[PDB]
Scaffold this active site. Structure first.
Site, short mmCIF file in Angstrom:
data_model
loop_
_atom_site.label_atom_id
_atom_site.label_comp_id
_atom_site.label_asym_id
_atom_site.label_seq_id
_atom_site.Cartn_x
_atom_site.Cartn_y
_atom_site.Cartn_z
N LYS B 10 0.87 -1.20 0.00
CA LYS B 10 0.00 0.00 0.00
C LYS B 10 0.88 1.22 0.00
CE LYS B 10 -4.56 0.35 0.37
NZ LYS B 10 -5.38 -0.50 -0.55
N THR B 57 -3.79 -5.57 0.56
CA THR B 57 -3.15 -4.28 0.77
C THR B 57 -4.01 -3.45 1.72
OG1 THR B 57 -4.15 -3.12 -1.10
CG2 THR B 57 -2.15 -4.39 -1.55
N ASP B 58 -5.33 -3.63 1.67
CA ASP B 58 -6.22 -3.00 2.66
C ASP B 58 -5.86 -3.37 4.10
OD1 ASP B 58 -8.81 -1.33 2.87
OD2 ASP B 58 -9.19 -3.06 4.20
N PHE B 159 33.00 29.12 -10.79
CA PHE B 159 33.15 27.95 -11.64
C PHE B 159 34.05 28.27 -12.82
CE2 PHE B 159 31.74 24.52 -14.61
CZ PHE B 159 32.25 23.46 -13.86
N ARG B 176 29.12 33.90 -9.08
CA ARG B 176 27.80 33.53 -9.61
C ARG B 176 26.86 33.23 -8.46
NH1 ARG B 176 28.36 27.15 -11.73
NH2 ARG B 176 28.80 26.40 -9.59
N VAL B 227 29.76 22.77 -7.46
CA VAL B 227 28.81 22.03 -6.64
C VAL B 227 29.49 20.77 -6.11
CG1 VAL B 227 26.64 20.78 -6.68
CG2 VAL B 227 26.85 22.99 -7.82
N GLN B 228 30.26 20.11 -6.98
CA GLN B 228 31.01 18.88 -6.66
C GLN B 228 31.86 19.10 -5.40
OE1 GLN B 228 30.45 20.12 -9.72
NE2 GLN B 228 30.53 18.49 -11.29
N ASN B 254 21.60 22.05 -9.96
CA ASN B 254 22.15 23.39 -10.03
C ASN B 254 21.09 24.22 -10.73
OD1 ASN B 254 23.78 25.62 -10.16
ND2 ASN B 254 25.42 24.69 -11.38
N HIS B 256 19.83 27.26 -12.31
CA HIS B 256 20.55 28.40 -12.89
C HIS B 256 19.81 29.70 -12.84
CE1 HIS B 256 23.25 25.30 -14.26
NE2 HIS B 256 22.29 24.73 -15.01
O1 LIG Z 1 -5.93 -6.96 -6.95
C1 LIG Z 1 -5.71 -6.78 -5.75
N1 LIG Z 1 -4.53 -7.22 -5.25
C2 LIG Z 1 -4.19 -7.10 -3.97
O2 LIG Z 1 -3.11 -7.48 -3.51
C3 LIG Z 1 -5.17 -6.43 -3.10
N2 LIG Z 1 -5.18 -6.15 -1.80
N3 LIG Z 1 -6.37 -5.50 -1.53
N4 LIG Z 1 -7.12 -5.40 -2.69
C4 LIG Z 1 -6.43 -5.96 -3.70
N5 LIG Z 1 -6.66 -6.13 -5.00
O1 LIG Z 2 29.20 23.66 -10.17
C1 LIG Z 2 29.11 23.34 -11.36
N1 LIG Z 2 29.44 22.07 -11.68
C2 LIG Z 2 29.40 21.60 -12.93
O2 LIG Z 2 29.68 20.44 -13.24
C3 LIG Z 2 28.95 22.55 -13.96
N2 LIG Z 2 28.80 22.45 -15.28
N3 LIG Z 2 28.35 23.67 -15.74
N4 LIG Z 2 28.23 24.55 -14.68
C4 LIG Z 2 28.60 23.91 -13.55
N5 LIG Z 2 28.67 24.27 -12.26
#
Ligand SMILES: O=c1[nH]c(=O)c2nn[nH]c2[nH]1
Ligand SMILES: O=c1[nH]c(=O)c2nn[nH]c2[nH]1
Ligand SMILES: O=c1[nH]c(=O)c2nn[nH]c2[nH]1
Ligand SMILES: O=c1[nH]c(=O)c2nn[nH]c2[nH]1
Ligand code: NA
Ligand code: NA
Ligand code: NA
Ligand code: NA
EC number: 1.7.3.3
Lengths: 295, 295, 295, 295
Positions: B10, B57-58, B159, B176, B227-228, B254, B256
């Site tokens: 679920k 799942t209910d 950069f 920048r 950034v690296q 990043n 821009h």
């Molecule tokens: O098709 C279903 N599969 C499930 O596993 C399920 N569990 N609740 N309702 C469901 N319906």
């Molecule tokens: O910080 C940056 N890393 C990058 O790899 C990059 N490439 N273009 N501008 C950038 N700025």
């Protein structure tokens, strides 16, 4: 057929601006997304393929960058007013400009208890927005807003005493979770033009701060009778604190968290006073709106 | 044909849990999204339509809620280990459980300088995650991570000195903007079972806090050569501070921000030392990865 | 500390290519999103700030456009193999290239029953993808896939005879809705290099078409005993139809549609044989995976 | 302070309905997302914490399912009108209902050239929408729309003769790519009530089909002078074909595909008449709107 209304322009223009203080070495960044739509005597571009009346949307994009280069971008109410005014003054046949700005958060980092001079963090997707409508001969209408402010309280929210009929299954409650995403807009009195907007510049950031503070405090402290009642309290306080606001609008989802009955499993108690584990619901959601003005 | 591998379960199980302190009235909330996938002697459900081997799942969904009711949900490394262990012990024919947990931020509100007892704010979409693989007879493998931590620095990134050939147009730079969304994962030494995970419980929150702090400080303080080079410095420090980590992996876009040449417009100067207004680029983006271990 | 693994490159490179037929005037468009990550003797960029070993990610971006200009971009298996091979042959110290391509649908419009020469529609967000790993001295590994194929059947799906214990609340059923988003991947036998990939070019589009057709037909016609059993039938048929495939992997969500009991309202009958209105559930969802190979 | 406007209700209510033909065994499915907001004499819930005037949003959700059980859900114009009318007639103090419906595509599968009786595919994220405003004593206003229809033409679009000034860098062109996501809305004349909506039921699907066909044909066949000029042609034709429409509104992004100059690399020719490889731009985008009515 006839053109009844038309507007066109550039949307989703991302803009960043940095301010570098000479003496202190401190840098401050602003980032926004801007949309500008124009109206005026442009019907013939639609009806007669007459492009001579079109200020290209690419040129509108250039203008946004040039304007940001030559003017402060904060508060956004001022920047939007400068930008909209430019178009109606520069082009004889353009008579209205509609400017929407979304401001993104870049909050200065604290490293080892000290504010860092040039490093920033996006603390939440909450936005501050403006909508500025500049209409030739009718001045400047500004709506300011905050949006994307997501909050939850785990108790001190109630909902009982609602209408009950043959469509009703909801149980009354005196203790529930309340969670919402706040969208709040305050509409300023009409301004006569750019000089008047300039005269009120300090009020813009202050009113945003107030709106945010009132929202958070009221949400946290109200023993809420409903989303309706709590939101009204918020709006009332904002109107009381800033006389230049005409209306305040709130739009609030009610994001439900449901109790899970586990009693089928070995009599496990997880409802009412014993509720500890809940299932957040993605949908549906309540949606509650209100616009509050002066009586 | 034959089944070579199979797992089922679920996904997207949203869970909220509240803890209420009796004496102080303080409430603390946790919200997570959980996925559990099982493996074992289940091939016949695929090949022979034999559902007798399927834990619905209910039922897996029910089990997640029951387990959250009866156990602490923090740290998530512990909760995931409890949850995965349950399935391999309860069902003879299930031999592996794979538990992924995403933890959502609910940060206690400060109202008037005081922490509020039951009101919370989502401050950013940053997540804390775990992946727990519980394999019968092979113990418990845990990968812890943070993701969605978005940062920007406006200077002190360089950069230059990269390979230049007939495919190269990029200009070398000594100043920048650097902005990224941090995804950092630390992989724990294999644990023999739940008792051993319990014995190390305090290390989980502490190591998360360390990883976050090292990431932020290194990003803010490094005069980055790339950034690296900056990411390697981060990973080195985390490994030095927690002996029970075997490897640290970083994956960094990043994002821009491009200079905008405005010189075509009245000789306006907005490049190199005069650059104030930039255009954030939504795509493409750089993507830089590295896994660092002990020599 | 030591670098255990490293890869870097450019993600989210959007590419469009148009082919114009000289004689017929017919145009055909291709649009893709490409990611290229490189590995090789690049550790010193991380550990010693030695950029001399870095092919800039900006140059990788240029190379993608140049390669698309000079070569066919279809089938994507061929284009990815050309692109990956370029990097390992051009740069002595680069020893692996990892190329991921997502192909977006632009389907020719039919206007008045005739195919239009230069107008296209995006009919669904279904994608065709490839992952190509080019490793110096180890040849070319290709995984082809389709994803985002969303289907629903309103009857002829069953689920009964599963394990029932104290965690089980799910009722057995002989008639339910089954809806899923299909993610299917077929892995080709290793190819020795580009000449061998070229020799099999016609098989790529044919096998994609087969995989799609088998998926749709089996889904529509199987009186499904479970998602597990239906998916296995699909994979079995694909393996039987293309001898150059080694394995087929399916990953299928079970997107639930729940009955709504309306009997509380005037005895309205909407369950079992009377079920007409259902509530689609956004989450949680079942997730069922299997990899099928040759015995 | 006073409440100036208020509306509240339930959003994001997902609904599926199946129709089973008795004689033929053919099944047809409908899936929608529904939002209902109410207005009326509800101010006291905001100002006085008086919940007695609130029809709970949970009850609105129940009502949507009950209404879908007892009525056809197609055309959506009819279903929305039934739903909105229910609220204003059932509750004395509710005076307006606002119903928004998004219809999702489930298109019957063709297997071996024959339409399948109970299997469906989501062919694209294109939606058909309605907005229905039911206002007590003022009848029923319906706006119908299609949205999410994404198209591209690779030639036969031009843009020249626009205004050129000191803000302009855009080059005139006689051959460009045009791609957009179509949002088209047609507004019906006001209807007096449900009986009148019923009387026009066949026109709803027919007008949707017409709007779609006119959009596609005009886009494909127009040698477009601008987005403005092409969109106007579309709207003109829809108004001519359905007398009960008062206005047609189009909102079209211009999703740019940029030429890539590759001449720096061995004089490679990829611009103007030699352009084959383009870079799709995610943002910004042009945005062009127009509302066309009868003269
Ligand atoms: O098709 C279903 N599969 C499930 O596993 C399920 N569990 N609740 N309702 C469901 N319906
Ligand atoms: O910080 C940056 N890393 C990058 O790899 C990059 N490439 N273009 N501008 C950038 N700025
Ligand atoms: O605060 C609430 N307001 C409402 O209108 C409502 N309706 N259901 N639950 C609710 N909660
Ligand atoms: O069709 C177009 N309309 C416009 O208004 C415009 N502006 N720039 N490019 C454009 N293309
Ligand atoms: Na003007
Ligand atoms: Na077991
Ligand atoms: Na090489
Ligand atoms: Na009424």
């Amino acid at each position: 057929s006839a053109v009844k209304a038309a507007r066109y322009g550039k949307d989703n223009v991302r803009v960043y601006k940095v301010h570098k203080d000479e003496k202190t070495g401190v840098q401050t960044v602003y980032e926004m997304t801007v949309c500008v739509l124009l109206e005026g005597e442009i019907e013939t571009s639609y009806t007669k393929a007459d492009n001579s009346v079109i200020v290209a949307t690419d040129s509108i994009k250039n203008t946004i960058y040039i304007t940001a280069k030559q003017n402060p971008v904060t508060p956004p109410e001022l920047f939007g007013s400068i930008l909209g005014t430019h178009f109606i003054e520069k082009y004889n046949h353009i008579h209205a400009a509609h400017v929407n700005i979304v401001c993104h958060r870049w909050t200065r980092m604290d490293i080892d208890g000290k504010p860092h001079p040039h490093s920033f963090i996006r603390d939440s997707e909450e936005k501050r927005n403006v909508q500025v409508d500049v209409v030739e001969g009718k001045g400047i209408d500004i709506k300011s807003s905050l949006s994307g402010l997501t909050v939850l309280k785990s108790t001190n929210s109630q909902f009982w005493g609602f209408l009950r009929d043959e469509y009703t299954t909801l149980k009354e409650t005196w203790d529930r979770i309340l969670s919402t995403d706040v969208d709040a807009t305050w509409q300023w009195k009409n301004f006569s033009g750019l000089q008047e907007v300039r005269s009120h510049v300090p009020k813009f950031d202050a009113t945003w701060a107030t709106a945010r503070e009132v929202t958070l405090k009221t949400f946290a402290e109200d023993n809420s009778a409903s989303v309706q009642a709590t939101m009204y309290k918020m709006a009332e306080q904002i109107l009381a604190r800033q006389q230049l606001i005409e209306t305040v609008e709130y739009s609030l989802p009610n994001k439900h968290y449901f109790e899970i009955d586990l009693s089928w499993h070995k009599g496990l108690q997880n409802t009412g006073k014993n509720a500890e584990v809940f299932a957040p619901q993605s949908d549906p959601n309540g949606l509650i709106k209100c616009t509050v003005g002066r009586s």
